[PDB]
Structures are given as structure tokens and as C-alpha cells.
């Protein structure tokens, strides 16, 4: 019942086709040097570079409306810091140590899918659990999760297993935000599947 207006309808619609998936997928021209974007955007692979955290942005920045996408991140390919969220065009996408790079600054917001913590302007210590509460605490992030960006309310939230888990972050209005992840695992293959948009004020 905390879902963005329009999300249920957006998710029930026929999914965007492979062309749309590529168009809204990872950007080969906007990722870490240590990442390769494959299949025209459908997934990326992080090369096995030591002492590096590496990010990617989607090709398309969202300034309005409701957008959603599915991230597929194999359970065995997460390593010590696997973070899923969004970033402005200004967020850094590489650093020379293993860390929750996405969410470590003012330009990025991330959920640590290993630890369950939220990062925005955070170096890690003290970061809050999401979703809050006992159900939320025991939640495991399976291979697939949905990322939901509501630019009318200015929220980012997530869904697993058919259930929206609530807004994770507020304070996103008046930005242009891109799908983003940060990864540390050699040879991880992280997929993005765009699920579409509802551009109108109430979606």
C-alpha cells in the first residue's frame, strides 16, 4: 500500500521488448573502465581487477514520471559489496578499494543487497536497514529484484518476489537519475531489464 501510484499497472503491462531493454540498459560509454557492457546494454561484466569497485549507469536519465527495471545479479557473483540503486550523471563510477561506492556520496543512492543497508552520503558504518522491521530484517535478495523510481514523489524503492518493499529513499525530486550499481566481484554479470514508464503526474 506504499507503492507509487501507477506501479501495479506499469508492472502488469506487456514488458518492453529487447530494443527498449537495450535503449534503457547499461551504457558502454558511462561505466567503469573495468566494466564491459554486453549485448547492447542488457548486461555488463566486471573484469577481474583487484582492489577496485566499479559502477555502471543506464543510458537513460529519468527526470519525471515513474520508471522501473529489474536487476538480475547471480547469488554467487556478489562478493563483499554489491549495491543497487540510482545515480546522477555526476556520481563517480570507480574507486581503488572495495566499498559500497554507490551511495557513498551526494550523487548516488544504493541498497546493499548483501547487508540490507541503505547508502546515501554514507561510508558504510551506521547505515540503516531496509526494509525496516522483522520481516524486512530476514529478507534475502534473490537473483532478481525490481528497482522503482518515482520522480513525482521523489522516491526510490524496491520489490522482491512480487511485493513492493516500500520507499527506501526520499528526496529525489528535481534531479535526473540513472539506473546504477556498484560491484566488486571478478567476472560478475549483472543484467538490467527495463520495465517501462508512466510519465504523467499521477502515472
Amino acid at each position: 500500500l506504499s507503492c507509487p501510484e501507477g506501479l501495479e499497472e506499469l508492472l502488469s503491462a506487456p514488458p518492453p521488448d529487447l530494443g527498449a531493454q537495450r535503449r534503457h540498459g547499461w551504457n558502454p560509454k558511462d561505466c567503469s573502465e573495468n566494466i564491459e557492457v554486453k549485448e547492447g546494454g542488457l548486461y555488463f561484466e566486471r573484469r577481474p581487477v583487484a582492489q577496485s569497485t566499479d559502477g555502471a549507469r543506464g543510458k537513460r536519465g529519468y527526470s519525471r514520471g515513474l520508471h522501473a527495471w529489474e536487476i538480475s545479479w547471480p547469488l554467487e557473483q556478489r562478493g563483499t559489496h554489491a549495491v543497487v540503486g540510482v545515480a546522477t550523471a555526476l556520481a563517480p563510477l570507480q574507486t581503488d578499494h572495495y566499498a559500497a561506492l554507490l551511495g557513498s556520496n551526494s550523487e548516488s543512492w544504493g541498497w546493499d543487497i548483501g547487508r540490507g543497508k541503505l547508502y546515501h552520503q554514507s561510508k558504510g558504518p551506521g547505515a540503516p536497514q531496509y526494509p525496516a522491521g522483522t520481516q524486512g530484517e530476514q529478507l534475502e535478495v534473490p537473483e532478481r529484484l525490481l528497482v522503482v523510481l518515482d520522480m513525482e514523489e521523489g522516491t526510490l524503492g524496491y520489490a522482491i518476489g512480487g511485493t513492493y518493499l516500500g520507499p527506501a529513499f526520499r528526496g529525489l525530486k528535481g534531479r535526473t537519475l540513472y539506473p546504477a550499481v556498484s560491484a566488486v566481484w571478478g567476472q560478475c554479470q549483472v543484467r538490467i531489464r527495463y520495465l517501462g514508464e508512466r510519465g504523467s503526474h499521477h502515472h
Binding site: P48, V49, A50, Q51, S52, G79, T80
Partner: peptide
């Protein structure tokens, strides 16, 4: 390259 994160 053989480290904790498969590098």
C-alpha cells in the same frame, strides 16, 4: 586475481 572478490 585470487583475492577475496575473485580478482
Amino acid at each position: 586475481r585470487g583475492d577475496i572478490n575473485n580478482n
